Design a binder for this molecule. Sequence first.
Ligand SMILES: NCCCCNCCCNCCCN
Ligand SMILES: NCCCCNCCCNCCCN
Ligand SMILES: NCCCCNCCCNCCCN
Ligand SMILES: NCCCCNCCCNCCCN
Ligand SMILES: [Cl-]
Ligand SMILES: [Cl-]
Ligand SMILES: [Cl-]
Ligand SMILES: [Cl-]
Lengths: 291, 292, 291, 292
Amino acid sequence: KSCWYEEEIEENLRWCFALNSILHTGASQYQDIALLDTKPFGKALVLDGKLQSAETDEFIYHECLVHPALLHHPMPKNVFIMGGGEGSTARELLRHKTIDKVVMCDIDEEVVEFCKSYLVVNKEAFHDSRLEVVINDAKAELEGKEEKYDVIVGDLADPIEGGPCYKLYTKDFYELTLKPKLKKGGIFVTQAGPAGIFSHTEVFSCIYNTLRQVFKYVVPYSAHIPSYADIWGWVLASDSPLDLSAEELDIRMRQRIIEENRYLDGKTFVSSSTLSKAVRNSLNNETHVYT
Amino acid sequence: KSCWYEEEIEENLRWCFALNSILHTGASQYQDIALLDTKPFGKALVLDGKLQSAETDEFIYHECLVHPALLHHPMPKNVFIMGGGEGSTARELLRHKTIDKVVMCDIDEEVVEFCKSYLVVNKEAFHDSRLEVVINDAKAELEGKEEKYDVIVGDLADPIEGGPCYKLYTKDFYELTLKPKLKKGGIFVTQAGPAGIFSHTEVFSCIYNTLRQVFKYVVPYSAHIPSYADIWGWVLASDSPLDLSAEELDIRMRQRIIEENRYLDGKTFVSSSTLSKAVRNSLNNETHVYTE
Amino acid sequence: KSCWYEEEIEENLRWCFALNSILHTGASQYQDIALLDTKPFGKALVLDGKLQSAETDEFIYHECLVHPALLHHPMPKNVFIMGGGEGSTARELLRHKTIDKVVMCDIDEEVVEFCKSYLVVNKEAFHDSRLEVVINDAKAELEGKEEKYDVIVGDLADPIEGGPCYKLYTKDFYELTLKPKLKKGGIFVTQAGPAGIFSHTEVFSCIYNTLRQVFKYVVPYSAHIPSYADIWGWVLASDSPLDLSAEELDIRMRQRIIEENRYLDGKTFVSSSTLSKAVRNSLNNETHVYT
Amino acid sequence: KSCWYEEEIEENLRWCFALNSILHTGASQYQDIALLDTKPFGKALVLDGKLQSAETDEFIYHECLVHPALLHHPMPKNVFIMGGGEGSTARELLRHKTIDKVVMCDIDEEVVEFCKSYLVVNKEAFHDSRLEVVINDAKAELEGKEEKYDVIVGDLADPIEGGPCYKLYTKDFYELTLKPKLKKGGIFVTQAGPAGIFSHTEVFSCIYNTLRQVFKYVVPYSAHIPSYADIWGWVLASDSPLDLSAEELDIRMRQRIIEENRYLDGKTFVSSSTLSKAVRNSLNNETHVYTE
Ligand SMILES: NCCCCNCCCNCCCN
Ligand SMILES: NCCCCNCCCNCCCN
Ligand SMILES: NCCCCNCCCNCCCN
Ligand SMILES: NCCCCNCCCNCCCN
Ligand SMILES: [Cl-]
Ligand SMILES: [Cl-]
Ligand SMILES: [Cl-]
Ligand SMILES: [Cl-]
């Protein structure tokens, strides 16, 4: 009961974890970096006093972020990650047998170097010959290269939290920068912030509605991440249908992904994409568009 | 913001709500009772320092606890609540037009009387002529009468070897006391504790497995409750099938329940009853059975 | 263990009290006002999230603030309080049999009204015919009236915490506004902030040294107030000697103060005014002057 | 500032220090051991979640515990410490040029070894040829040998009916075990717990009164220790008088102690030994005596 990490997850709500140690610290010009060894959730990466990922449950976030998008694609070969940095999104992508190139594009090289040093789980990923790490703003990087991708993965900070990432959630970004970089049949997925019965209105509903303005097919889905103290959300978007059965997803996971997923099977995905009454209605009624 | 309610979810995890006021604090010999006015979740009922119900989201717990059971029943008329006390379970049950009688059987009259006075959301419920409040141990109450019920609802504290609720979660209780007091087609539902990816192993899987030893059809389901900082669980159990589609559930809700549910439609229940890979497998492989 | 009031008494130090209730709230234009019913210290007055006084131990602060100054005066009849507001400083002054006028001069009428309503302990004081409550800045009020006083009592906020009160600790204020309002033989006392072995350097040492520039005789003294999580300080200042024995103080307390003091006797005062080695040396070496 | 060390001073009061790091955490079967790097107070030694010593202000506790006793003694050569363990008590004792031998008798060798390695302030002390470390219960150690001492120093945990230190605070211990092992002119000093206006009644007054039953001259004294969030107390006890002026104490310090004290001069001790009105009277009227 002695030592605690405390985070105010909203103005009137605090989440505190007991600590074993403060393992490593760092800073970049951009943000303070800490790896805490926490009692409830293991090793926790904290950026400017905000938890990013925890050892015990980051697999849920990263499996949910990555696998549904790739599984719905008939043959995904190259993927661009906007953000990432920790190595975990790349790790999950690199489990797919069809993938021959992963680009991880994140502005903060010291975070990437910190994670390559200290997030043991991603050592194999960071050494895989298919991974290229680009240190740049993702918008500038997409704009400046002609390569198109089968899948693009948004693994950036939530939009409302500041300026830099906000631009990467706008209708104009999606329409005029992101789509031209998707191959025919391409799939976009983004993390879409909290997706709780009330917390979902902060950004999840707006991200969903913004994507609805741009892509023909949009599938929001969500899952509990214990260390985040909330349900978290993601949104798939494509100009081709996003419709697979639990059974087809399972067959695809067996065919295409090395080793067994820990969190996600077909039925889990079907559950995740079946939102509750209130959340579904709220997503339906949402009028705000990043724009 | 200087004033906080703090709860130790686990010994190593604390969940803190900023406080507007402390509306009441007190105690029976069973437990201390407090009603807090919290900023994030509104008015919150706390028993022995453990949050029970918050105003903003208790509808989730009570709709999930009540509606799936009654909706799977062909025509539920008579229901018995083990515990409850706050009136919210009763409130949701009384939304069903099929219902003729609800018995609320709680051991702590001071909690009932507190909530009857202070939880104004339940004032209608508490004054409904269909409601009977009995102050008793639920095992004693059930065993002492031959009346049977269409649905019996477990709304008790989580089981803890050596606590007073524990006996109401055992195999022998379910087999020898509860099952004999269910009518033909009867459905049991209990709250079943935390149901998180890791937290589900403390009691949810055990409750599921204990029920699997007694009833033919057992349906575990879960939903997030923000004020609880976890996914929470419930389990349906019956000797008649529990297999309705989303749409059939919505039809039944429209026909049978007064006003629109806030949380639960049929798709929500189907989603709730599809557990994740790890939790499904953990439940399947669980060998713990609560006994005596 | 459920409900807590937390205060950051410095940037890296937090003090938290368990709560029974939040009794009354208020605000003025100047500050948010709260009366908390705390488990360890009883009813606690909190102004803009800073504890002012607690029921169980405010007697220590108010007895220490008031009695030594009056007891060292041969016959104190009128007293002006810069600040106060709660009624407790006035309460202690009104126990002296020699006193025929107390002026309480505080800028915030709603705090005074709040305390007259809710600080039960000071009901008799607030009804005593000798008390006048003036709603004004103390500097403006001293400047604008010709009356002089036997004792002036500084019961204001610490100087470094903001602007309004800071001016009431400067060498120029003391020299040119405060002294001209002291009668021949008059005594000044001010609360002088934290007086801990390290905390004393924030303001206590500076207040002491500032008064040393202005008055011939200056006596700093201190005492623990549990609810304040520190030793607290006061400074006496006069152009006449401030030298009484414990025995003489005791005789005077018996002659001049109605009822028994709870905290202070002569020996207690002698102890209070005997500071520790490090604190004494630090006060000696202090060069900062509010100025 | 996101990371905090928290200590429950009382069940209703918490005192929290921002944390730089957790330098070590561990345990013997007696107690968990942690060394924290705190922002306000530097490195802090915590035993079973209770702060023992902080770097910025431990000098206050250890100078107050040690110097008054030795200075009131005419020529103290041989001293026995009950407890200690951290090395700081020993360190202050070894500043006295009169001293020929210090015995540190602590029950928990893991605490001694931890501090010998991690408290670099005490490295000199621990390597001083005048220091002997004995791992034993202090009652057993004293009773088992006929060696007597000029000063015996109690540096143990506060007494708690049923804890292992408790016996070292009883009337019978002091009379029948400790007093026989003091030399002519011998002085006992113990730490005596919180000594706040209200907190002093938990143990400080009891310790004072227990000693008043055994020794002729008993001098309670106190001082603030910021990291402790309270005034702390100690008590001197002797069958020879304990009445020196501030100036005589300063003379003795100059003559006998290596380097300048940081906290304690003679005036400080006289101030420390003048308790406030309420505490003086509370001590005077105390009837509790620690027994067996
Ligand atoms: N601590 C509350 C939970 C916050 C969780 N945030 C999840 C989104 C992760 N985004 C990573 C951004 C990496 N560039
Ligand atoms: N641990 C934080 C959340 C706990 C919430 N408990 C939900 C189950 C409610 N059961 C209590 C029934 C009335 N005694
Ligand atoms: N909470 C930390 C302790 C702060 C105590 N402050 C004591 C000074 C009181 N001054 C009162 C000012 C009234 N106008
Ligand atoms: N409760 C917070 C402060 C407690 C400080 N304790 C001081 C007494 C030190 N005694 C321990 C002796 C070695 N076991
Ligand atoms: Cl990544
Ligand atoms: Cl109920
Ligand atoms: Cl006043
Ligand atoms: Cl030692």
